[PDB]
Ligand binder design. Structure first.
Ligand SMILES: [Mg+2]
Lengths: 244, 250, 211, 235, 231, 222, 240, 233
């Protein structure tokens, strides 16, 4: 019958690894690098679009940075289509929480929920896992500014600074070298772009090959603002930091 | 009976490749060339009507399809997969949008819905991916004119101009040289016809070429008068005669 | 019907009448209105005898399965709850049940009132049935915690008699039970007809009745 | 791969035959039936000295008149015990009486072959079900994952089973006392066990008509072990 | 070989190996004999023990007052099939106030077994059954194979070494069919038949199992000292 | 509107002796003011030395009896032909009845037999499952006419010993099967006179250690 | 639905999927449990391959199931969340239906049952997780420590360790832990738990987590500095 | 739950020494309207059973089809379908009785009163009643509806108890049945003159008589009846 053709996506290897999760991670390692850096007065999200074209409509394009709600955003590394399925689910979860408790969803609770969905695909159902790694950048009144990452295994962890996608080994070393705890957003912006500029597989880092975002309390008084950078604004910050 | 294939047929290989998606993209590569060019006041989509037999009436086979009054689609790859996607795309535009908001969806969101369907065929149990790449051109009030490509993976990208299928690599290079941000719709149609001639071997005329535009509202194609706000569809399929007229000024 | 139960120094007393009626016709002179769930648990009966018997025997199943799994006797609090939770499933469907769950556990003697409503109340004294008002009067005026087992047994016995006399739908006989930490002890079936005359003489009560 | 409910060319179910191999790796459990009661004894086999051995529960009460010992993948036994306890109590609810030991055993064995593509595989544990009823007296059954159950006068299951069964072949007779059976289980357990038998790494139990099913205290078993040592040194 | 992985697969010569392997389980099973006259039908079964401490596995199951069977192969499968027969016999009585014809009982068993041979996931039954019964058309004996094949016979045997008993019945055909109104002589012929399948072991008191049904005889099983008469 | 229930009349009576038991009931079946049958048996031998009668709505009574007889059959299959004790049968019937708590068998049921000590036993049920063991119980149409009589002549209620003037009760001496049958016949003869649904015939089943025996007696046909 | 039997017996009588789940536990960070006379301590390894971590928000290794019971683990992190959630739901379900909080043994039995169920249900794989469940029963001052594993077996331990290099720390505990006289105080119990992890951990900095659970719902997690003082005192005695 | 629309009145029957007789008129009433005059309400099943049905006709036609299907189904894989394993009256009745009680237990009855009359394999007479409630009973005489009130009294004068059955001949039984049908025609407002009668004898088998009429009626005395009390003319 059908058994013959079953790849069995949810099984352990003899070494105790999940084949499909490991191969999904291999897929993600070829995706454009995404970086998150948490500062005392905000969070930075920086990501590299993959080998683009001159005819690509960049200002209406979105492949890396997505808004989950007004307080929480994600950077994507892997299959974009897979990511959008999960993103829409996360958006709904945030609204369910807001409807139920009349308060914005705490960042971790949203992260845990999505990470649990990923986990389920590795344990039951016989389907392939989502080939996606997320960097979550968010704010709530309990823990303030937070960075998380999740991968196809459904495991998530918190970070001060982190990278996903290609060249994470090189990227993480560079971040670990120059990161400090008393760092500010404007400094973090510079670190993120410098790290991408050194780890990129492209010849040079330009505005058309980047997506950029910040989450700041640089919103008028006690509140938080999300800023998805426009192509011209990415071009300006590249000049400001002295990369182009 | 029962569909006992409740497991994924697309899976990650050791190298991180999703084989069935790659192979679907290979099927798209073998497909006949189709293209799309965005102008300042319109969008054009075009393809070759590769007739399987001269006894076949190629007018009855529509490669360029209306999805909504302001959105049109064309493809490269497997025709039957495209046909059913058009049926689903037309319906989802109503069920998940028009019946809720009382208006047709914007291009990007209809594309998103089509993309979702294609993504699900890449992960759901007991199905292969769709063997097509779609080029969807459209217009809506707040986003203006737009052109999107949708691949078998479900990934979609907005383009100023692009080509897919047989001679896409050569066609995209041709479009890069000719495209600018000041093109009028007639200029885009002219460039479309030029680009498309390179990939066509045999007859090149209005009967062997299928071409449509997203442009100005067509009140003559609305079918009724009396409501000022209803001004007619922006999608229009060019006739065999209309194509031949522009082939003399080629 | 008349049932009561109360907690005191040396455990809990449980007393009930024995009558059953079909309108004015007395269908049963001797009906057991106490359920021997297990050697340490008792259940009274009020309303549909079918529903009382069925669900309390089903409770016994659950209490026994509890002991087998946990290797420890179930508490009166837990037992009473299991029962109330069964009622809450058929909430609105038309069950009729009013039972006191009597027992002795770690926290000492225990008494819980449970009804078809799902309600579950803890307390030192309860009485249910068409004749509960008569029983409460005798209880309230004579109840102490400092009661001896002998006096307590008589009190519950006398309180049923009070109801049996006045209430038309209560009578027949009195069944007594005493619950200790070593289990429950049955203190017999007492014909009301014989008990009435006996009490009237010894106690001097019921002067208005000619004997 | 291949079906879970597949027959071999010899006419045996592969999965059932393989589960029997898992039971061979389990710790030894021995049962001896007498006219004064049935004795159940097990090897605890703690994997480390820090493991509190009294938490090893390989002998279990099903009802007051039925006990049970296990060998193999002991985690699989929990749902079987739960079903057995439910069946025993449910029958008491429906019929106001104790359930027959055979009927209880048959109810457990009905679960066995409910596997396929129901549970995904057979149970990897064998059970020695011992009990007493008024109709057939003291009984000992061996419940397998095949769905088959044999009644036994004495039976050993687990890693030292064939050696123990040969020993039970010689030692059992129809006039054994309860005390004789107790010492006999201890003797054969001590023989097949890797580590030296004591009250902490071995457990005894019995079922009698009067007192029902009882697991023995470590103090009670320790005395029976000391009684065993002296009687073996007596000749 | 490559076609025995499941029941849903024909071999190149048109064989169903999983069914054939299920048939093999019957051959491993202990011998049982069936035979009938015009007034009675008899089952005789050689029970098998695990060892000397163990009991002898029961082989005969009662289905109704007028019907029952003996098994050879997987005992749990016999319990499933016999339970189904019990229900069907019972459905006929409760709904139609009618005792279930033995021939119809055979048709029902055939169809139940057949479904397990044509579908994926399941397995064939690993047991053979000899059904005896007395209905409105007299005494009957059926042989059930888990392939689905059910056959009405005067006599037969299934299990290990069953060929010896089957040859004996084939010789004795003209004699035992005429044993009318004599239950003891019909059982004797069955005990003599099953004796042709014995090697090394002989028929003891807790080894032998006998059942009988007839004109004025409900289906009754004889075990223990009740069969010492026939040893 | 469809009324799924009906009343087929009839009256039944069970008495427990010291080493025997009787279950009697009239053989008349009726609807409203019409007679359906003058002889339609209502008390049955269910096997295992148990007799049963489901009085009230005949269709539900026939269904319950049919089910119980089936429960006996399967008890034998499942538990190695073990005999079903009267107390076990009683508890089983409770569960048969309560399975329709929300669409009951409109019948008042009685069973009779011997307990496991050989003594006489009678169990009485209500439509929804509650049950209890008794010495004497009349059920059905003329139950209210018969039960007071039995309280008086079987349990000697309100009867005292001459000379004492209410100080000493009449001692509860056991009754013989012949004595019981007289009380049964006189019960039904009296009921037949004053109850229109009672008449035609009386069938009694007597249960002893030797087995089940039947006795039939004519009743007035008006 | 997907019904495929993933956990099945092999010719030698092994369920490889269950055994491969144990290999996932072997890969997981080391967890240790030590019960004193009036407390239980749960120690957990944190691999220092991950720095730049935000320790405020990163899922802690020890999780409260109820106010009086905790659960630590070794193996797949994502898998452990499912067991923890189920355990927490069951804990509230028990309080709601029985009016007593769960015993530590009951909670262990439930979690172990869930793990077992996933070894013979169709379409699912076993949990790649072993757990240490510790606490005190309601109105009881006797310490409780249990261990579960993917197969679904569970048992009580005076002291136990699971995860990578657990063989080494178990070796240490077996020679250092005396049953006749367990760590009489909180100090001694924590000291022995830290000492045991120092056999395996590497640096005694942020790699060691300690959580002390005392009777009557008294649960606290030690900070870096508090643990660092134990690390300091241990090695200064060792220099001799 | 429904209400009957097109209805059939009384069905009457009785046992005699060698068999049973059953009869029923050929009318299908629509309330007070005598709508259909050619309705057969006696339905033979084989050569040993006749099922007489009163009540809702649409439900009768449904039952008629169940019986026809029952005969077909019994013949399946049955070499003795026309012999030892042929349908008996008791089988047919119990089947119907099962259906009727099940339908009432779903609160969707077959609005009928049925009498199954026939002769068993051993020659015994079979006569039993069943209705929409699933109620069953047997008696030497059986009748439905009005027949229960008017026919039974007359038929019971012939066979008052079981011992009268052997004393009753087919000629006497048929005569009593035919008289009863006349009485019902006089007194039942929902009856017709035309009827069918069936005899199932253990020797002569099934005799089915159609197109019978009520005859020998008394009406002449009506001419003398004038007014409602005091009128003379
Ligand atoms: Mg009368």
């Amino acid at each position: 019958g059908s058994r013959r053709y079953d790849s069995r996506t949810t099984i352990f290897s003899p070494e105790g690894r999940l084949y499909q999760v490991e191969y999904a991670l291999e897929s993600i390692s070829h995706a454009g690098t995404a970086i998150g850096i948490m500062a005392s007065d905000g969070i930075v999200l920086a990501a590299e679009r993959k080998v683009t074209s001159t005819l690509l409509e960049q200002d209406t394009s979105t492949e890396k940075l997505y808004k989950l709600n007004d307080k929480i955003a994600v950077a994507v590394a892997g299959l974009t289509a897979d990511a959008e399925i999960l993103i829409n689910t996360a958006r709904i979860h945030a609204q369910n929480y807001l409807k139920t408790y009349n308060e914005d969803i705490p960042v971790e609770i949203l992260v845990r929920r999505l990470s649990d969905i990923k986990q389920g695909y590795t344990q039951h159902g016989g389907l392939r896992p989502f080939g996606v790694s997320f960097i979550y950048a968010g704010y709530d009144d309990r823990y303030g500014y937070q960075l998380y990452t999740s991968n196809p295994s459904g495991n998530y962890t918190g970070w001060k600074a982190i990278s996903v996608g290609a060249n994470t080994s090189a990227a993480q070393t560079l971040l670990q070298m120059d990161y400090k705890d008393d760092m500010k957003v404007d400094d973090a912006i510079e670190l993120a772009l410098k790290t991408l500029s050194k780890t990129t597989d492209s010849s040079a880092l330009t505005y058309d090959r980047l997506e950029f975002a910040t989450i700041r309390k640089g919103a008028n008084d006690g509140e938080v603002y999300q800023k998805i950078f426009k192509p011209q604004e990415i071009k300006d910050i590249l000049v400001k930091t002295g990369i182009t | 009976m029962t569909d006992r294939y409740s497991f994924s047929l697309t899976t990650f290989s050791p190298s991180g490749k999703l084989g069935q998606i790659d192979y679907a993209l290979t099927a798209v590569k073998q497909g006949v060339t189709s293209l799309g060019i965005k102008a300042t006041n319109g969008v054009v989509i075009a393809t070759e009507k590769k007739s399987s037999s001269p006894l076949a009436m190629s007018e009855t086979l529509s490669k360029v399809s209306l999805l909504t009054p302001d959105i049109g689609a064309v493809y490269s790859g497997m025709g039957p997969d495209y046909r059913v996607l058009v049926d689903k795309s037309r319906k989802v535009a109503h069920t998940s949008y028009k019946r809720i908001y009382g208006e047709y969806p914007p291009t990007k969101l209809l594309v998103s819905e089509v993309a979702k369907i294609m993504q699900e065929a890449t992960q759901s149990g007991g199905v292969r991916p769709f063997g097509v790449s779609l080029l969807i051109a459209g217009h809506d009030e707040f986003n203006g004119f737009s052109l999107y490509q949708v691949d078998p993976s479900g990934s979609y990208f907005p383009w100023k101009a692009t080509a897919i299928g047989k001679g896409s690599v050569a066609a995209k290079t041709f479009l890069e040289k000719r495209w600018n941000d000041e093109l009028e719709l007639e200029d885009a149609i002219h460039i479309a016809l030029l680009t498309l001639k390179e990939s066509v071997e045999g007859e090149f005329n209005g009967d062997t070429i299928e071409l449509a535009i997203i442009g100005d509202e067509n009140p003559d194609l609305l079918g009724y008068t009396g409501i000022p706000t209803d001004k007619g569809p922006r999608f229009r399929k060019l006739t065999s005669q209309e194509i031949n007229d522009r082939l003399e000024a080629l | 019907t008349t049932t009561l139960a109360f907690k005191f120094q040396h455990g809990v007393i449980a007393a009930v009448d024995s009558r059953a009626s079909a309108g004015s016709y007395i269908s049963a002179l001797r009906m057991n209105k106490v359920i021997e769930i297990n050697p340490y648990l008792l259940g009274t009966m009020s309303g549909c005898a079918a529903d009382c018997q069925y669900w309390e025997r089903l409770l016994a199943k659950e209490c026994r399965l509890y002991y087998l799994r946990n290797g420890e006797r179930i508490s009166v609090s837990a037992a009473s709850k299991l029962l109330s939770n069964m009622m809450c499933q058929y909430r609105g469907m038309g069950l009729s049940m009013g039972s006191m769950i009597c027992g002795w556990d770690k926290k000492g003697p225990g008494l819980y009132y449970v009804d078809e409503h799902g309600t579950r109340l803890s307390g030192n004294m309860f009485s249910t049935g068409s004749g509960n008002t008569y029983a409460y009067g005798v209880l309230d005026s004579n109840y102490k915690w400092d009661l001896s087992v002998e006096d307590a047994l008589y009190l519950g016995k006398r309180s049923i008699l009070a109801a049996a006399h006045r209430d038309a739908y209560s009578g027949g006989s009195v069944n007594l039970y005493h619950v200790t930490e070593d289990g429950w002890i049955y203190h017999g079936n007492h014909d009301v007809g014989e008990l009435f005359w006996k009490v009237k003489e010894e106690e001097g009560s019921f002067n208005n009745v000619i004997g | 791969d291949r079906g879970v409910s597949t027959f071999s060319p010899e006419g045996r179910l592969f999965q059932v035959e393989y589960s029997l191999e898992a039971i061979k790796l389990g710790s030894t459990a021995i049962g001896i039936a007498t006219k004064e009661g049935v004795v159940l004894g097990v090897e605890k086999r703690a994997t480390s000295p820090l493991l509190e051995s009294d938490s090893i529960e390989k002998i279990v009460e099903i009802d007051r008149h039925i006990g049970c010992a296990m060998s193999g993948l002991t985690a699989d036994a929990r749902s079987m015990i739960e079903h057995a306890r439910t069946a025993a109590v449910t029958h008491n609810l429906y019929y106001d009486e104790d359930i027959n030991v055979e009927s209880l055993t048959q109810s457990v064995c009905d679960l066995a072959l409910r596997f396929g593509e129901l549970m995904s595989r057979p149970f990897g544990v064998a059970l020695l079900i011992a009990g007493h009823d008024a109709d057939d007296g003291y009984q000992l059954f061996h419940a397998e994952p095949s769905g088959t159950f044999y009644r036994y006068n004495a039976k050993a299951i687990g890693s030292g089973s064939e050696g123990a069964q040969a020993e039970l072949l010689n030692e059992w007779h129809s006039s054994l006392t309860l005390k004789e059976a107790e010492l006999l289980v201890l003797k054969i357990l001590k023989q097949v066990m890797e580590e030296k038998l004591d009250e902490n790494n071995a457990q005894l139990s019995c079922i009698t008509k009067q007192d029902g099913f009882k697991i023995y205290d470590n103090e009670k078993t320790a005395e029976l072990i000391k009684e065993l040592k002296e009687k073996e040194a007596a000749e | 070989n490559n076609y025995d992985g499941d029941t849903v697969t024909f071999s190149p010569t048109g064989r169903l190996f999983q069914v054939e392997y299920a048939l093999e389980a019957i051959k491993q099973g202990s011998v049982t004999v069936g035979l009938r006259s015009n007034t009675h039908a008899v089952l005789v079964a050689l029970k098998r023990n695990a060892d000397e401490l163990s009991s002898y596995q029961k082989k005969i199951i009662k289905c109704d007052e007028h019907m029952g069977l003996s098994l050879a192969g997987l005992a749990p499968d016999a319990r499933v099939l016999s339970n189904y027969l019990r229900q069907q016999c019972n459905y006929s009585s409760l709904v139609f106030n009618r005792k279930l014809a033995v021939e119809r009982a055979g048709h029902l068993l055939c169809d139940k077994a057949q479904k397990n041979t044509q579908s994926y996931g399941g397995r064939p039954y690993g047991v053979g059954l000899l059904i005896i019964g007395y209905d409105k058309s007299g005494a009957h004996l059926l042989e059930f194979q888990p392939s689905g094949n059910v056959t009405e016979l005067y006599g037969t045997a299934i299990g290990a070494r069953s060929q010896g008993a089957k040859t004996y019945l084939e010789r004795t055909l003209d004699t035992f069919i005429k044993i009318d109104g004599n239950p003891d002589e019909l059982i004797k012929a069955g005990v003599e038949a099953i004796s042709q399948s014995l090697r090394d072991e002989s028929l003891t008191v807790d080894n032998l199992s006998i059942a009988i049904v007839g004109k004025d005889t409900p289906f009754t099983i004889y075990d223990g000292e009740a069969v010492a008469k026939y040893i | 509107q469809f009324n799924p229930y009906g009343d087929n009349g009839g009256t039944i009576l069970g008495i427990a002796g010291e080493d025997f038991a009787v279950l009697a009931g009239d053989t008349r079946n009726i609807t409203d003011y019409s007679i359906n049958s003058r002889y339609e048996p209502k008390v049955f031998d269910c096997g295992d030395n148990i007799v049963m009668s489901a009085n009230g709505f005949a269709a539900d009574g026939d269904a319950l009896v049919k089910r119980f007889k089936n429960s006996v059959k399967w008890y034998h299959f499942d538990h190695n032909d073990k005999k079903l004790s009267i107390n076990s049968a009683a508890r089983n019937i409770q569960h048969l009845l309560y399975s329709r708590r929300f669409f009951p068998y409109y019948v008042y049921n009685i069973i009779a037999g011997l307990d496991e000590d050989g003594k006489g036993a009678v169990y009485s049920f209500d439509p929804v499952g509650s049950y209890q063991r008794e010495q004497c119980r009349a059920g059905g149409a003329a139950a209210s006419l018969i039960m007071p009589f039995l309280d008086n002549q079987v349990n000697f209620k309100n009867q005292y010993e001459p000379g004492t003037n209410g100080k000493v009760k009449k001692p509860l001496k056991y009754l013989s099967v012949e004595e019981v049958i007289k009380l049964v016949r006189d019960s039904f003869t009296s009921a037949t006179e004053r109850h229109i649904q009672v008449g035609d015939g009386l069938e009694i089943l007597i249960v002893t250690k030797d087995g089940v025996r039947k006795e039939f007696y004519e009743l007035k046909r008006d | 639905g997907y019904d495929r039997a993933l956990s099945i017996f092999s010719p030698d009588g092994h369920i490889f999927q269950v055994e491969y789940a144990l290999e996932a536990v072997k890969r997981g960070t080391c967890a240790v449990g030590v019960k004193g006379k009036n407390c239980v301590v749960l120690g957990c390894e944190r691999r220092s391959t991950l720095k730049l971590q935000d320790t405020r928000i990163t899922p802690s290794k020890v999780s409260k199931i109820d106010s009086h019971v905790v659960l630590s683990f070794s193996g797949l992190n994502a898998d452990s969340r499912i067991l923890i959630e189920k355990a927490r739901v069951e804990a509230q379900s028990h309080r709601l239906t029985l009016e007593d909080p769960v015993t530590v043994e009951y909670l262990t039995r439930y979690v172990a049952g869930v793990q077992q169920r996933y070894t013979q249900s169709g379409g699912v794989r076993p949990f790649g997780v072993s757990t240490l469940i510790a606490g005190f029963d309601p109105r009881d001052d006797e310490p409780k420590l249990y261990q579960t594993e993917p197969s679904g077996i569970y048992s009580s331990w005076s002291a136990q360790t699971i995860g990578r290099n657990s063989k080494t720390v178990r070796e240490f505990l077996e020679k250092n832990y005396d049953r006749k006289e367990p760590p009489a105080t909180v100090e001694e119990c924590v000291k022995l738990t830290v000492r045991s992890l120092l056999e395996v951990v590497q640096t005694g900095a942020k790699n060691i987590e300690i959580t002390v659970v005392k009777p009557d719902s008294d649960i606290v997690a030690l900070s870096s500095e508090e643990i660092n003082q134990y690390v300091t005192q241990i090695e200064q005695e060792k220099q001799e | 739950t429904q209400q009957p629309i097109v209805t059939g009145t009384s069905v009457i029957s009785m046992k005699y020494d060698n068999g049973v007789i059953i009869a029923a008129d050929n009318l299908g009433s629509y309330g007070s309207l005598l709508r259909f005059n050619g309705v057969e309400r006696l339905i033979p099943v084989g050569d040993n059973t006749v099922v007489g049905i009163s009540g809702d006709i649409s439900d009768m036609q449904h039952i008629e089809r169940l019986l026809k299907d029952l005969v077909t189904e019994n013949a399946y894989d049955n070499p003795l379908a026309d012999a030892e394993e042929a349908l008996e009256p008791s089988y047919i009745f119990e089947y119907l009785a099962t259906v009727m009680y099940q339908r009432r237990s779903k609160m969707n009855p077959l609005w009928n009163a049925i009498i199954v009359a026939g002769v068993q394999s051993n020659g015994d007479q079979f006569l039993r009643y069943v209705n929409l409630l699933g109620v069953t009973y047997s008696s030497p005489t059986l009748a439905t509806g009005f027949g229960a009130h008017m026919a039974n009294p007359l038929l019971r004068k012939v066979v008052d108890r079981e011992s009268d059955i052997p004393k009753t001949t087919v000629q006497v039984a048929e005569e009593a049945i035919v008289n009863a049908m006349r009485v019902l025609y006089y007194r039942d407002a929902r009856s017709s003159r035309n009827f069918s009668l069936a005899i199932i004898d253990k020797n002569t088998g099934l005799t089915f008589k159609k197109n019978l009429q009520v005859e020998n009626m008394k009406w002449d005395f009506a001419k003398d009846i004038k007014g409602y009390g005091t009128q003379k003319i």
